[PDB]
Amino acid sequence: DKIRILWVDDEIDLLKPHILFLEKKNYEVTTSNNGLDAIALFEEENFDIVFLDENMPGMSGLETLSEMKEKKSAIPMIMITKSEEEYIMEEAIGSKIADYLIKPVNPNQILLSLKKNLDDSRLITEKTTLDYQKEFRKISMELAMVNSYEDWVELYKKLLFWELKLEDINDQAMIEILESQKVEANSQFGKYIERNYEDWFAPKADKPIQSHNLFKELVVPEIKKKDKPILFVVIDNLRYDQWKSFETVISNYYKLEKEVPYFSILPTAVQYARNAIFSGLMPLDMEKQFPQYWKNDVEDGGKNLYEAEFLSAQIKRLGLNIKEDYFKITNYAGGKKLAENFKALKGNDLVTVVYNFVDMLSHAKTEMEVVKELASDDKAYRSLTLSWFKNSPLLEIIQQAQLLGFKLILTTDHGTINVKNPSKVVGLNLRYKTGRSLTYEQKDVYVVKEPKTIGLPAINMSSSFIFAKNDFFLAYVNNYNHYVSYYKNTYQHGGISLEEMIIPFLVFNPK
Amino acid sequence: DKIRILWVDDEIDLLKPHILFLEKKNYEVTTSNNGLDAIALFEEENFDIVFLDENMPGMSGLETLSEMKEKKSAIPMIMITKSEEEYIMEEAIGSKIADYLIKPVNPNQILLSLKKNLDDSRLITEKTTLDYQKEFRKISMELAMVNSYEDWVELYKKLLFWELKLEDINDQAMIEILESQKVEANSQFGKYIERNYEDWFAPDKPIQSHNLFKELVVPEIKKKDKPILFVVIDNLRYDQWKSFETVISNYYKLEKEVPYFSILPTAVQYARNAIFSGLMPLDMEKQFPQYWKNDVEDGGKNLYEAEFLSAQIKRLGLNIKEDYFKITNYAGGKKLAENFKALKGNDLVTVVYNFVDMLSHAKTEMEVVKELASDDKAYRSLTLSWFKNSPLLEIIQQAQLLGFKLILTTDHGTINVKNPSKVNLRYKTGRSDVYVVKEPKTIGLFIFAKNDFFLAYVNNYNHYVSYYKNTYQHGGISLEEMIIPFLVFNPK
Ligand SMILES: [Ca+2]
Ligand SMILES: [Ca+2]
Ligand SMILES: [Ca+2]
Ligand SMILES: [Ca+2]
C-alpha cells in the first residue's frame, strides 16, 4: 500500500516538482484546484492525508477542511500556504491542523510532516525498543552500585522514565527485563533502608527530607516570600509514577517551579506520615505533646482527625501570623463543593486541601473486580489515574486557584505497591505491624525492637515494629490461604519500597 | 508572562535575524553555542520551549535532547537544522520531537511552531466554540425535520460529533445548548418509536436485535474468505465506541459501519438473546421454553445464548465450526487471550464481554466509580482507559495475527437517568412519561421509560430517587440505548 495524498491548491500546476519528489518517495498524490473537487475526491476515495492551500478561488482551505473533517475526522490535514498572517495561523491551529507549512516550501519539509504525522507512533516504538536495549545493561549496573538515598532517587527517576516509555512498546521481553530491574531495585532499596533508617535519626547524621520535616523545610520558605497565596494540596497515596502520568495535564494550568523527591517516614501509612507533615513532629512527639490529638493503632476511630489543629500549632510554633484554612476531601460532593466555593478562599494566604480518592481507589482493587480490570498492571493504574485527574474535582480546585493567582504546592504522604508474595505473621496495614508477641520472617521484614529510636510510639518497651520489604504482604497464619487469595496482587502501603517511600514535592507558579 | 525559548546552535550569531524577529513578538530567547551549556541552562532555569541544531561541534542536538528530556520530560523541544537526511528526521520523530524545521527557515514558520506547540489548546477551544455557535441553529432545525429512522441515525451522528468536540470547552452557554438538543432528541425519538415501533412488526423498519445475525452477520460469513471474531460488548453507547475508535484503528481497518436499533426493552435478557437467536421475546418463549426465562423466573437469563446461536445457524441452514465464550471477569478475559491461538481453525469465534455493563451500575453504588464517571466525558475517558488495557484488546490483537475479520457490536446502551417516574428501572412487566403497550403480543414480547426517566416504585419512592438519580440505566427508549453500532473490520 502506498500512502495516498490529496493536495488541493489553485496553483497546483506550479507545485509539480514537489509532487515528483513525493512520487519517488512512493507517495501517491491526487491533485485538485478547487475545494469542491477536493470534497468530491475526499468522499469518493480513501486518502491517508490531505494538503490544503488557504487562499483558493472558491472554497477556502479551512472551509474545505471543516467539510472533510465532518466526514472523516481521523484523516490528518496539513496546510501549505503563502499566508503568513498570525490570525490565519491561529484559525487553522484551532481547526486542528496537523501542520502548517509556509510557501515556498522545502520538499523535504513536506516529507518531515508526512513522516511526523503518519509514522510517528511506529518510529517512537522502534526508537524506544532500541534505545532501551542499549540501556538496560547499564541500568542493571547502576542499581548494583547504588549507595546513597540521592543515588536511589536518581535511579528511581531512570526506572520511572523507562516505565512510561515502554508502555508504548509491544516487546514483552524488554518489559519483563524492566520489571526484573524494578524488583531488584526494591530488594536492594529495602536492605539499604534496613541498614540506614535508624541511623538517620542520629543527631546531624545526613538524612533526606522526610515526612515530619516537610512543612518547616520546604513550605515555610514559600510563605516567607509573601508574594502569592498558596494552595497546599496533599493527595494521599500518590505513587511517583501516577504523578508522572498526569504531569502534562497540570502543565496546561501550572508551570513547575520546583520538584524535590522526599522520603516518607516509616510506617508509610496515613496515620503516621500525614500527621507528621502537619505537625512537624515525629509520631512519638505527637503522642507526647498532643495526647488530645494522637491516636495509637489500638485506639478506635480516625487517626488523622486533628491535622488542622497540629498544623495551626506548627504555624504558631514557627511564629507566622497568617490567614490559614484546612479542608479534608473524602468524597466527590466535598471536592465539588470546595471547587464551586474556592472563590471565598481568596483572602486566605494559605489553603491546605487533603484529597483521599487515590488511596480509596488503590484499596478498591482489593474489593472490586471493576478496579481489578481497570488497574490490572501499573500502566493500567497510571491510565486510570490520568482518566481520574483529567476529570477530577481536584483539577477544578486547581484551575480555580490558578484563576485566583495562587501558587500550587502538590505533594503526598506515601505511595503503594502491588504486593505479590506472602510472609507469615502472628501477633492492620499488611506491610507494617506493631506489638509485643510478634512472630515474623525476619529475612522478609525490617524489625525495630526499640520504636522510640525511630521516633515511633511504643505502647510497652516490649512493643516493636516490623515493615515488609519488596512486594511482601504480611499474612496471619490463621486463615493463611484465604489471606493470600484475597490480598495477592493488591495495592498495600505501610512498608518499604521505592513506590511507597520516595514520593514527590512539587511547587507551581500560576500561568 | 513572556514565553522563554532556549535556542542552541553553533552558528547562533548567524541566527540574529530570527532571534530579533521572535523577540519583537514578545518571545524571550536564551542562546547557547553548545549542548552542554544548554543542558546546564535547562536545569538551572525553567524554559517553556527549546530549539536545537543537530550538526554542532560537541554533542549533537539529538544527544542534547536525550539528556534534557531525562531531566525535564514535559518541556516541548523543536529541531531547527539543515539536515535533510531521512534518518535524522526519523531519529527526531522517534525521540518525540514536537517539530523539525529544515534550514534556511522562514521566521514565520518558527512562529507557527511556537503557537502550534504552546497555544493550540486555547485556539482549539476558541475555534470549536465558535464553530458550534454558528451550527447549533442548523442542528435544531434538522432535529425539527427528522421524521424517519435513517434521519434519526444521522442526527445522532451529528450530536455525537459535537459531543466529543465540545467536551473540553469552557463556555457554559454553548454546553447547555448541546444538552438541550440532546434532550429534545430523545424526546422526539421516543415519540417516533412510540408511534412506529408497533407498526415495524407489521409486514419500513430498521435493522433490529432479532434481525442482526441473519441480515448483517450471515452475509459476511457466506463470503467464506476469512475466520471471523464476533464480539458483543454488553451495554456499549455509541459515544464510548467513538472514544476508543482510534485505538481499534491501530489493529483493524473498518470495512463497514451500520447503526441498528435494539429491540425494546433494551436489556441483555431480551435484546442480546434475540441477537443470538433471531427471535422476539414472545417467539423466544414459544420456540425455546427450554432456554427462555421471564422476569419472574430465577437466575441468569443469558446462559442459553450459545444454544440459541447454534440453533440460528441451523435455522439459517448453514453448517460451520462454531464456538461461544462469555467473559465476565478479568481472569476469564486474560485466560482466553492466550488460548485464542488454538481456536483459529474453527470458522467463527463469538466473544461476549460483559465488563462495560458491570462498570455502568458500579457507579450506582461505589463512590470510586462516581468520581471516575461523574459525567459523560469522564465515562468515555474511563472506557478509553479500560479498552487500552483490557484483555479484550489482547483478544482482538490475537485475532488480527490469526488473520480474523472482526465484527464488533453491542445489544444496547445506557443513559444517565435524572427524572423519576412513579410506579431494572427502564422496563416493567405488569400494570400499575412512558410508552404503554397494552398487548405484548403486537411488539413480540409492558412500560417503557423515555427521556432519562427512571421508574421508581411508589412504596419506596424517595429512596429510589435518591439512590438511582444520575445513574446509568438501560432497558428503555433513547438514542443512547436503542441506536447502537455494528462494525465489520478486515485485519491490518
Ligand atoms: Ca492560492
Ligand atoms: Ca491507605
Ligand atoms: Ca550547525
Ligand atoms: Ca445491565
Author numbering:
A (entry chain B): 2 to 428, 434 to 517
B (entry chain A): 2 to 204, 207 to 426, 435 to 443, 450 to 462, 471 to 517
Show passages lifted from the paper:
Here, we report on the structural determination of PorX, a noncanonical RR that comprises a classic REC domain and an additional enzymatic effector domain that exhibits phosphodiesterase activity. Our crystal structures reveal that the PorXFJ adopts a two-domain dimeric fold with a classical RR receiver domain's fold and a unique alkaline phosphatase superfamily (APS) domain connected by a helical linker region. Each PorXFJ monomer adopts a two-lobed fold containing an N-terminal receiver (REC) domain (residues 1–120), followed by a three-helix bundle (THB) domain (residues 121–209) and a C-terminal APS domain (residues 210–517). All PorXFJ dimers adopt an intertwined assembly, where each monomer is symmetrically wrapped around the other monomer, forming an overall “X”-like shape.
Additional support to the link between metal coordination and residues 358–369 conformation is provided by the T271V APS catalytically inactive mutant structure. In the T271V structure, a density corresponding to a divalent cation could only be observed in Zn1 site (coordinated by Asp360, His364, and His499) and not in the Zn2 site (coordinated by Thr271, Asp237, Asp414, and His415), while residues 358–369 of both monomers adopted a helical conformation instead of the helical-extended coil dyad observed in the same primitive orthorhombic crystal form of the wild type. Moreover, ICP-MS measurements revealed that the T271V mutant had a reduced ability to bind zinc with only 1.22 ions per monomer, instead of two seen by the wild type. Using the REC domain's phosphorylation-null mutant (D54A), the APS domain's catalytically inactive mutant (T271V) and their double mutant (D54A/T271V), we confirmed that these residues can specifically undergo phosphorylation in PorXFJ. Mutating the catalytic residues T271V, the metal-coordinating residues D360A/H364A, and the APS dimerization interface residues S384A/S388E, abolished the observed phosphodiesterase activity against bis-pNPP. For example, the catalytically inactive T271V variant exhibited a mixed population of both monomers and dimers, while the zinc coordination D360A/H364A double mutant remained mostly monomeric upon incubation with zinc. However, our attempts to co-crystalize the catalytically inactive T271V variant of PorXFJ with pGpG did not reveal the corresponding density in the APS catalytic site.
